[PDB]
From a paper:
RfaH, a paralog of the universally conserved NusG, binds to RNA polymerases (RNAP) and ribosomes to activate expression of virulence genes. In free, autoinhibited RfaH, an α-helical KOW domain sequesters the RNAP-binding site. Upon recruitment to RNAP paused at an ops site, KOW is released and refolds into a β-barrel, which binds the ribosome. RfaH recruitment requires a 12-nucleotide (nt) operon polarity suppressor (ops) sequence, which induces RNAP pausing.
To answer this question, we subjected opsPECRec after NTP addition and heating (37 oC) to cryoEM/SPA, yielding a cryoEM reconstruction at 3.0 Å resolution. The resulting complex was nearly identical to opsPECRec with a major exception: a clear additional density in the secondary channel showed that the transcript had been elongated by at least two nts followed by RNAP backtracking. These findings establish that opsPECRec is elongation-competent (i.e., can transiently adopt a post-translocated state) and that, following nucleotide addition, RNAP slides back, generating opsPECBack. Third, we present a structure of RfaH fully engaged with RNAP in an even deeper paused state, which is likely necessary to recruit the pioneering ribosome. Fourth, we present a structure that captures an unsuccessful attempt of RfaH-bound RNAP to escape the recruitment site, leading to a backtracked state which is rescued by accessory factors. We do not observe scrunching, but the transition to opsPECBack must be accompanied by at least two translocation steps and likely requires scrunching, as proposed earlier.
Author numbering:
A (entry chain J): 246 to 831
B (entry chain I): 1 to 890, 912 to 1342
C (entry chain J): 99 to 147
RNA sequence: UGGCGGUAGCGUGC
DNA sequence: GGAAGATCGAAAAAAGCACGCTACCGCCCGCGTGGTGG
DNA sequence: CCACCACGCGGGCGGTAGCGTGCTTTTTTCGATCTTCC
């Protein structure tokens, strides 16, 4: 049909002709020429050549490029035949059937809103007004403000106060589907309740960020508006963020503090040695908080508080036990936000990221799902507030260089020099001396890292009430490394200790390692050596994204028609699962 | 050393101890000079247009009586300059006129002497010229042609690492890559056979090529093998034995000579036997008759008695054949020396598998392989073979190609013919055989010494040569077609092919990219870019891992950190600061020669190939006085690896520490403290910062800002020294010095600054004067600051006060908290200029015209429009407003241009383009009047200066005749010239001066006439359009949540909240912080450079605050001088020395005024200030050395529990604005084919629900949501209408219907001859 | 958007999908090599019937 | 306001 | 001892190369042939 | 008599030939041996 091959009207009177029209014209011209020559009784060779050319034209129209030279376009491109636009990524199946552009959709960058709840997301007023235009029109017509669609459109365009009130009314509990571009798994799209904000950026709940794999460094996300009762209820009951707390891949929880909540909780749940107000006796967590706020007791002071904890009875009831516990002011303050069922032992520790995740999992297992979201929200609020109050900062003096690094470097260099001179004397070959140098440098790097960790983790000294003693370090870098907020042991080693050996792009290791810290300067040679690994990793990621996507698509297709259609088969067969053991470990 | 005038205003405190031995060269030298090589009149035909003409011309027709020859070429004066070409949208180019001589030979004469000659000048198209900033103006748009890194022509040897044949065996191959010709490849078969391929076709034996080169089997065997002589003595077959040939084999018999049994039967041959043989000097040896049976004969042997050959050449011997040879009278035979480890019999096996046996057969086979189907014949095959590799037309090995070919083959001379030869192919085969045997080694494809750089000039020359060969084919046809009685060379040739080729190359090529004008750094990076893509290069998808890696040879030539991230990573690079290009296209880097253990001053430029031979010491090497090395075992790099060496083994030293970084990567302070990935991201994101309305100098810099700003064309530099005669916000007029004066010149330089002109990224280009009235200037001094430039220093961002601490989770991972002061102080607002073009065409029904009256519109809509139908300049408009009123006949329908929805701003510029022969509206008249007024103002200034000079001369002449001071002063200025005088030479000189004055007046009048004619000249347009109206809209965009900002260390984020000023934390003095950042991003990203930059900025701001406080108290100049001298003298053996005693006591005041905002600090890329220097600088001010103070919470009030890191950091605003990304749609236009919503924000389309989203919805189980989003939202037209009506009616129900895309697919499949239908049953 | 047309070919032409897409349907049905099918189709060699 | 090709950029283990 | 099934490696042909989004440029046959005007 | 504008009908482009040339995996076919027998 002509509309499937339309003639686009261009400016100036020209017409854009699709490749299908050109191929059809070629076929028609060839057929007419063949008919005319057959009428004229042409010799055998001429009519045979005409028939061959007609066959070639028909083949090109049906599927261009299959045989012989493909018919070229205006600017030396193959023409798009009938089969060219059916298959492939740009074909009809993968461009207009599996996926398609939709209405009632928008796109905007995403920021962080700490005040939002787990089921709430910020939506700009302009985007909400644009997306919910038909609903506003319907409500305006119902209210009698506008007697026709044109009047409603004009009123919405003019943006009076009544329009804003109607917009606020229509999105009271209307979920919106927020989705990110790399939808690797089902968690990439989730339903949220919109909260009207002014601006042009969507506000996202921090706790779901790990689910979205989204960083606030220019990320853009799309929002779709479900527009029927079935879709609204499906979003509320199935794709709501409050219902997605366990990862279907492995069952591990997905709502976990990542960077700031963990640091705040770790700082609050930490004990000093001679902090202000130590040794006091408190009647409850409320007194502890009123002491901390009044600036009369430190957050790390070790005190004894009388607290009541609720334990779940066998029949399902809660029994209250009151006892005096030796703890810190911060732990007592944090205990109040903990629900009744949980015991006090969860918060009586440093409470790192793993401890926080374990506490959340225990709360979900014992209390259930309804208190779990409230507990997570309270945890995030308290962590953010106390991280702000702590004022943790990174400085050039935080990353301390061990005083024994110079001696270790000197002795390693002396050993390398003696190995080199022994090789020059002919006792050992190139491979043996290379292996010896590599082992010596690896041992030196390990010793440097160990000395750095020893000097950073606990080398702090504090004067208690009477003498001096040691304790866990309060260094900011160590604080965020031990709590699991950010960084790791290797990263801290690269910052303060030696960078270690580096490998050339081929794969072999370089004899001379980078013996310079990141705090200290790196000369040109060390930076040039280190650039190889970064370039290799970046290239690997760039060429790996496409392969991972292709594998995911193939796996999705190979299992696209498997659903649970039965309850039991009565089969007496199965796999005999046993623990897996390889070598000398399980 | 004396500071320049532009530097004395604000001297940057420069850290670093390594003296500057070589200054940074001109950044835009790779491009400009190259194009100069394309334009310069070469006395010899080896470069550019002259070389192309000499290669093509002269041409001889088929008949011997015709000839055409080329004499000289000349590039004409461009009609329009760069500014006119840019504003009018025409291409900036120059005419090319070539002197051509057509010679008609005397055909009647047997010798064909010259009979007639006709010389003329022929115009041969337009050549696009290159502007002074290294960029082209194509169709009024700025385009940049990036250099291409391609494979160097020559011979390259390689081998697969056992991947093929699935056993790990290496198949060695060699390739001959010519600049213009057919590729020739040789490969080793798994069966150890030589094969030859041409242009990647089916493999053929190389012996076929050898036979086609007129080589017999005997000659081939002699060339590729060493003969072994077997002589038939009276007995025991004495043979000439070479002891070295006995190595690596076994004792087939009892080797005994002169009654001495050297080796017994069946014993392995060890080196002792060969050394014994060499010492004893034994030549002849006994050999059993059976031992020959394994040998292969070397040449044909024919019996004289029978006349028939007993055995031909190259086959294995046998006992019966040996007996036949012995009884035929033969006494001496020759065989091939074959070894299984040293000299393999590859040639013999290839000859065995070769079916051909003569030159004619080989030529026929080659012709059949090259041109299948055509009937082979002797003449055609011979011609094809001769023209394939031995014709200057079809085959052309470039000079660099010949040099590489000679160097690879170890030839002495590096100059040779541009075509191949028998010796070259023989040597290539011999080298391949040697490599297969074990001698030598393969070449590295990724080695930078095997890769060439092609600039714009080379590609332009290639395209011009293609056009030239097309034109010469046309002229060859025309000369024979026509009769030479009356032909003229003007009409003999055509210029369309050359013009089309050059236009396509300069406008529609993969390397002529759209130049980005985000900031001068972006332009510099784009101009200094190397791309491996393009024609005759690598492919983005088919690249691999090896090509994207950082080769060791990249040191000093290609920046390792400056490269795009994503699909094309490692295929695009940036030239180093000091890197340049050889005459052969190879990259080279400077070095300092070291003689006798000391470092000299001479600079030697070393390429990649020759650098490996020498030992080069790293830049970070401590040197004492006179250049000796303080330490003996210094670190160097010998051959692609780094190791320790003695101080006497060094040969060259690095020129500077910035040798390996690019221009973009050298602007990051404390780079050595930053991770490679974060450094790469920061370098890539530096060139994306939009220019702010008020440029702010960087407190912490690297000292390269001045070079980047000066080299880029954004700033206006002084061509000649002098004083500023008249400084204005729009133009600058300076009076040149008498030393730099020229004869017959007024001596006034006029610079017209460009104000509020949109860039390629819709930003604002503004130039503001940086000099005052009467301020002396020198050559090269900056007169006006370009966009994002402050006093000649690049200024991409602003020095913002920052504090590293979490704040209620608002910063969280990467988000940025911004105080309200940043918005209040207007520190990040940008200006964006947008085009709006309305076209009045000529429809077939009638010509549409622009008028002020539009049917069925309100008066308020056209109130902004004037009586000419165009919106008033300076009038603020919003979305939906009418700008230009255009109506087209149907009686007339409204087609007036309107402001796009969601777009506001103020109209700042209106341009009208009218086709020639059409009356011009009064708006165009006003614009032309304004341009004429400006030109007349400039010419009137020049005329008044020259007239003042002439009238001073005539006054002096009159005074010489007679003083008449009172009479002269009491006379009008113009009446002076006519005053009479006595009959003498005074009257003669007076009338000569009058003649000069009137001649000058006439000359300036005709110059004004030419200028006005040029400005009023009608411009050509497209066919069918009679008018164009362009309107510029200017918008001030302010910072807000969602905008993306970043620093120089790869730390990026988006604004999360515009916090109130009182909410931000404040110090003891009560000054709040402006920016709050999360420390959590520091340890993970390794970017400790930002912390050091923050500390240095805090120290600089403390110094500036002390200076400002001293200034406020009106302290005497002595205290200011002492304090500034103490501040500058701080450091540890810094190379920079500043003396304030020679500042005339007045420039100190200006320096203090400039520094009151903060002392600038220059931190080199690898020779920066240490932590001790930063702490000392902090101690100089009244700031703590630790760099952390105690902050108070703005909202709550008490002290923070721990000190926080505060300071001043350079922040950049990237070109990613939230208002440019925000988009929403409920309903709108749909595609006319698939009936689906459009795509993109510009088309008001909807977001695409891809396959991954569909899979996620299926996993969730939301069947109804998927069904409604698939059918009733996108495709089902009836479903869409019904759903809209239901929503308007308040009913939330839908009808699934049937998507239109499925119907389209069904119809398309039916059109394919396949019946597909829906079966209801 | 639904009505289709038809062109009456002067001589029959084979479908490229059923001829070139390996395995060739025509060749498999006729038990003859694909090269012979291409030779007869594009007027290179006669075929007995 | 309709699409193709080329180019460049953004978000994608820190 | 010649013909048919085996096979075997080597070569040739076909299909694929993540997902969203933004901006710019270029193009949307074209060339001979007849009509008509200066 | 020459130059600009409209209109219809083929098709690789342009040339008295040649243009290409940095991927991997799977499927099909074919010459060449082979090998196994009837
Ligand atoms: Mg990100």
């Amino acid at each position: 049909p002509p509309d499937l091959r339309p003639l686009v009207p261009l400016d100036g009177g020209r017409f854009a002709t699709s490749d299908l029209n050109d191929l059809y014209r070629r076929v028609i011209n060839r057929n007419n020429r063949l008919k005319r020559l057959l009428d004229l009784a042409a010799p055998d060779i001429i009519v045979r050549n005409e028939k061959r050319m007609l066959q070639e034209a028909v083949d090109a129209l049906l599927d261009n490029g299959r045989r012989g030279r493909a018919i070229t376009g205006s600017n030396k491109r193959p023409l798009k035949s009938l089969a060219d636009m059916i298959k492939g990524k740009q074909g009809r199946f993968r461009q207009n059937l599996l996926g398609k552009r939709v209405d009632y959709s928008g796109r905007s960058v995403i920021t962080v809103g700490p005040y939002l709840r787990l089921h709430q997301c910020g939506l700009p007023k302009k985007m909400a007004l644009e997306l919910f235009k038909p609903f506003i029109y319907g409500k305006l017509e119902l209210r009698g403000l506008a007697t026709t669609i044109k009047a409603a459109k004009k009123m919405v365009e003019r943006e009076e106060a009544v329009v804003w009130d109607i917009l606020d009314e229509v999105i009271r509990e209307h979920p919106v589907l927020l989705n990110r571009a790399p939808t690797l798994h089902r968690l990439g799209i989730q339903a949220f309740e919109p909260v009207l904000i002014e601006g042009k950026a969507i506000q996202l709940h921090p706790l779901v960020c790990a689910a979205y794999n989204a960083d606030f460094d220019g990320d853009q996300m799309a929002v779709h508006v479900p527009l029927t009762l079935e879709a609204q209820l499906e979003a509320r009951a199935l794709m709501m963020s409050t219902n997605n707390i366990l990862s279907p891949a492995n069952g591990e929880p997905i709502i976990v503090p990542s960077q700031d909540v963990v640091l705040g909780l770790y700082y609050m749940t930490r004990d000093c040695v001679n902090a202000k107000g130590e040794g006091m006796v408190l009647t409850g967590p409320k007194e502890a908080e009123r002491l901390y706020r009044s600036g009369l007791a430190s957050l790390h002071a070790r005190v004894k508080v009388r607290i009541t904890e609720y334990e779940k009875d066998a029949n399902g009831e809660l029994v209250a036990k009151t006892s005096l516990k030796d703890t810190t002011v911060g732990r007592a303050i944090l205990w109040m936000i903990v629900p009744k069922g949980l015991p006090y032992s969860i918060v009586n520790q440093a409470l790192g990221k793993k401890a926080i995740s374990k506490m959340l999992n225990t709360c979900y297992r014992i209390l259930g799902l309804k208190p779990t979201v409230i507990f997570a929200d309270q945890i995030m609020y308290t962590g953010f507030a106390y991280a702000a109050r702590s004022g943790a900062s990174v400085g050039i003096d935080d990353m301390v260089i061990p005083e024994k690094k110079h001696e270790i470097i000197s002795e390693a260099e002396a050993e390398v020099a003696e190995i080199q001179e022994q090789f020059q004397s002919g006792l050992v070959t190139a491979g043996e001396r290379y292996n010896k140098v590599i082992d010596i440098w690896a041992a030196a790097n390990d010793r440097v890292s160990k000395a750095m960790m020893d000097n950073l983790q606990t080398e702090t000294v504090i004067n208690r009430d009477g003498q001096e003693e040691k304790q866990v370090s309060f260094n900011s870098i160590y604080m965020m490394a031990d709590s699991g907020a950010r960084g790791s042991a290797a990263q801290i080693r690269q910052l303060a200790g030696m960078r270690g050996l580096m490998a050339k792009p081929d794969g072999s290791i370089i004899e001379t390692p980078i013996t310079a810290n990141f705090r200290e300067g790196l000369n040109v040679l060390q930076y040039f050596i280190s650039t190889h690994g970064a370039r290799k990793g970046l290239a690997d990621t760039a060429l790996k994204t496409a392969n991972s996507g292709y594998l995911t698509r193939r796996l999705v297709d190979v299992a696209q028609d498997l659903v649970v259609t039965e309850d039991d088969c009565g089969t007496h067969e199965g796999i005999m699962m046993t623990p897996v053991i390889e070598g000398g470990d399980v | 050393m004396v500071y320049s005038y532009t530097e004395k205003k604000r001297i940057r405190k420069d850290f670093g101890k390594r003296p500057q031995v070589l200054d940074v060269p001109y950044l835009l030298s790779i491009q400009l000079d190259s194009f100069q090589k394309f334009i310069e009149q070469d006395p010899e035909g080896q470069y550019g247009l002259e070389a192309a003409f000499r290669s093509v011309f002269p041409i001889q027709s088929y008949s011997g009586n015709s000839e055409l020859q080329y004499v000289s070429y000349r590039l004409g004066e461009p009609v329009f300059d760069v500014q006119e070409c840019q504003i009018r949208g025409v291409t900036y180019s120059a005419p090319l006129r070539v002197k051509l001589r057509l010679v008609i030979y005397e055909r009647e004469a047997p010798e064909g002497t010259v009979k007639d000659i006709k010389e003329q000048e022929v115009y041969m198209g337009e050549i696009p010229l290159m502007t002074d900033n290294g960029t082209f103006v194509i169709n009024g748009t700025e385009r940049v042609i990036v250099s291409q890194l391609h494979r160097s022509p020559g011979v390259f040897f390689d081998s697969d690492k056992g991947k093929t044949h699935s056993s790990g065996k290496v198949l060695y191959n060699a390739r001959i890559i010519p600049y213009r010709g057919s590729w020739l490849d040789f490969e080793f078969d798994p069966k150890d056979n030589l094969f030859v391929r041409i242009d990647r076709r089916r493999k053929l034996p190389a012996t076929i090529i050898l036979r086609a080169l007129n080589y017999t089997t005997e000659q081939i065997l002699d060339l590729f093998f060493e003969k072994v002589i077997f002589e038939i003595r009276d007995n025991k077959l004495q043979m000439e034995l070479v002891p070295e040939r006995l190595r690596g084999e076994t004792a087939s018999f009892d080797i005994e000579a002169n009654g001495k049994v050297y080796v017994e039967k069946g014993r392995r041959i060890t080196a002792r036997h060969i050394r014994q043989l060499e010492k004893d000097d034994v030549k002849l040896i006994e050999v059993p008759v059976e031992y020959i049976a394994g040998k292969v004969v070397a040449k044909d042997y024919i019996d004289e008695s029978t006349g028939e050959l007993i055995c031909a050449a190259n086959m294995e011997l046998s006992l019966d054949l040996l007996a036949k040879l012995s009884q035929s009278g033969h006494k001496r035979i020759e065989t091939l020396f074959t070894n299984d480890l040293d000299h393999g019999p590859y040639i013999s096996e290839t000859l065995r598998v070769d079916p051909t046996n003569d030159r004619l057969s080989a030529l026929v086979e080659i012709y059949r392989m090259m041109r299948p189907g055509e009937p082979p014949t002797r003449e055609a095959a011979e011609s094809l073979f001769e023209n394939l590799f031995f014709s200057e037309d079809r085959y052309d090995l470039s000079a660099v190609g010949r040099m590489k070919f000679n160097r690879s083959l170890l030839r002495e001379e590096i100059e040779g013919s541009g075509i191949l030869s028998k010796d070259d192919i023989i040597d290539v085969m011999k080298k391949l055989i040697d490599i297969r045997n074990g001698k030598g080694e393969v070449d590295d494809i990724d080695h930078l010494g095997n890769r060439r750089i092609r600039s714009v000039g080379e590609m332009a020359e290639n395209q011009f040569r293609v056009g030239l060969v097309r034109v010469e084919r046309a002229v060859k046809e025309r000369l024979s077609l026509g009769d030479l009685d009356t032909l003229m060379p003007q009409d003999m040739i055509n210029a369309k092919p050359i013009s089309a080729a050059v236009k396509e190359f300069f406008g529609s090529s993969q390397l002529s990219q759209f130049m980005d004008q985000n900031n001068p750094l972006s332009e510099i990076t784009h101009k200094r870019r190397i791309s491996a893509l393009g024609p005759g290069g690598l492919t983005r998808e088919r690249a691999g891992f090896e090509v994207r890696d950082v080769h060791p040879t990249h040191y000093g030539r290609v920046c390792p950190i400056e490269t795009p991230e994503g699909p094309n990573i490692g295929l695009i690079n940036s030239l180093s600061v000091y890197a340049q290009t050889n005459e052969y296209g190879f990259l080279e880097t400077p070095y300092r020669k070291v003689t006798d253990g000391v470092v000299t001053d001479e600079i030697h430029y070393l390429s990649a190939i020759e650098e490996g031979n020498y030992v080069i010491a790293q830049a970070n090497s401590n040197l004492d006085e006179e250049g000796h090395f303080v330490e003996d075992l210094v670190t160097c790099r010998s051959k692609g690896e780094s190791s320790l060496f003695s101080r006497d083994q060094v040969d060259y030293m690095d020129v500077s520490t910035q040798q390996v970084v690019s221009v973009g990567a050298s602007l990051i302070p404390f780079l050595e403290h930053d991770d490679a990935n974060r450094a790469l991201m920061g370098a890539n994101m530096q060139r994306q910062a939009v220019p702010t309305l008020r440029a702010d100098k960087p407190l912490v810099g690297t000292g390269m800002e001045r070079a980047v700003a000066v080299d880029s064309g954004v700033t206006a530099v002084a061509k000649r020294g002098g004083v500023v005669q008249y400084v204005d916000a729009s133009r600058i007029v300076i009076k040149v010095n008498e030393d730099e004066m020229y004869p017959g010149e007024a001596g006034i330089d006029i610079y017209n600054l460009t104000k509020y002109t949109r860039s390629n990224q819709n930003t604002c280009i503004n130039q503001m004067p940086c000099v005052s009235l009467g301020e002396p200037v020198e050559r090269g001094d900056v007169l006006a600051d370009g966009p994002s430039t402050d006093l000649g220093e690049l200024a991409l961002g602003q020095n913002m006060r920052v504090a590293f601490m979490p704040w209620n989770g608002y910063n969280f991972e990467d988000s940025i908290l911004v105080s309200e002061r940043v918005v209040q102080e207007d520190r990040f607002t940008t200006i964006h200029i947008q085009e709006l073009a309305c076209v009045s065409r000529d429809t077939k029904l009638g010509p549409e015209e622009i008028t002020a009256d539009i049917p069925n519109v309100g008066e308020a809509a056209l109130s902004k429009l004037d009586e000419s139908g165009i919106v008033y300049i300076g009038a603020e408009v919003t979305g939906g407003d009418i700008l230009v009123g255009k109506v087209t006949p149907k009686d007339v329908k409204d087609s007036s241009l309107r402001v796009p929805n969601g777009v506001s701003g103020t109209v700042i510029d209106v341009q009208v383009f009218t086709r020639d022969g059409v009356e011009k509206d009064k708006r165009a008249l006003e614009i032309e009047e304004m341009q004429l007024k400006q030109a007349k103002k400039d010419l009137s200034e020049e005329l008044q200066i020259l007239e003042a000079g002439l009238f001073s001369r005539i006054r002096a002449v009159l005074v010489a005749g007679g003083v008449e001071a009172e009479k002269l002063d009491k006379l009008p200025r113009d009446r002076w010239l006519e005053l009479g005088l006595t009959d003498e030479e005074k009257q003669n000189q007076l009338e000569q001066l009058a003649e000069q004055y009137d001649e000058l007046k006439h000359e300036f009048e005709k110059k004004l006439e030419a200028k006005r004619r040029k400005i009023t000249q009608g411009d050509d347009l497209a066919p069918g359009v009679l008018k164009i109206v362009k309107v510029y809209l200017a918008v001030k965009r302010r910072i807000q949540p969602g905008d993306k900002m970043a620093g120089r260390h790869g730390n990026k984020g988006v604004i999360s909240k515009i916090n109130p000023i009182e909410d931000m934390p404040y110090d003891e003095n009560g000054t709040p912080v402006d920016i709050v950042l999360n420390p959590l991003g520091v340890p993970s990203r390794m970017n400790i450079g930002q912390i050091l930059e923050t500390h240095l900025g805090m120290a600089a701001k403390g110094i500036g605050d002390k200076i400002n406080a001293m200034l406020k108290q009106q302290q005497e100049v002595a205290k200011l001088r002492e304090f500034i001298q103490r501040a500058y003298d701080l450091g540890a053996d810094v190379r920079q020395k500043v003396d304030l005693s020679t500042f005339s006591d007045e420039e100190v005041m200006r320096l203090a005024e400039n520094l009151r905002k903060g002392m600038p600090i220059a931190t080199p890329v690898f020779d920066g200030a240490k932590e001790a220097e930063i702490k000392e600088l902090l101690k100089l001010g009244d700031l703590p050395t630790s760099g952390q103070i105690r902050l108070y919470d703005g909202r709550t009030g008490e002290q923070f529990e721990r000190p926080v890191t505060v300071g001043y950091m350079y922040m950049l605003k990237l070109n990613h604005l939230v208002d440019d990304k925000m988009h929403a749609r409920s309903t709108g236009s749909y595609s006319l084919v698939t009936q689906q919503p459009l795509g993109g924000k510009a088309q008001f389309g909807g977001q695409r629900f891809g396959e991954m989203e569909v899979w996620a919805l299926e996993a969730y189980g939301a069947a109804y949501t998927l069904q409604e989003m698939l059918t009733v939202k996108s495709d089902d037209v009836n479903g869409r209408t019904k759903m809209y009506k239901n929503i308007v009616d308040g009913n939330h129900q839908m009808e699934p219907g049937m998507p239109e895309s499925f119907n389209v697919l069904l119809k398309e499949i039916r059109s394919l001859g396949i019946n597909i239908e829906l079966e209801d049953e | 958007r639904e009505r289709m047309g038809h062109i009456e070919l002067a001589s029959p032409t084979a479908h490229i999908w059923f001829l070139k897409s390996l395995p060739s349907r025509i060749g498999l049905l006729l038990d003859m090599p694909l090269r012979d099918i291409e030779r007869v189709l594009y007027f290179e060699s006669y075929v007995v019937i």
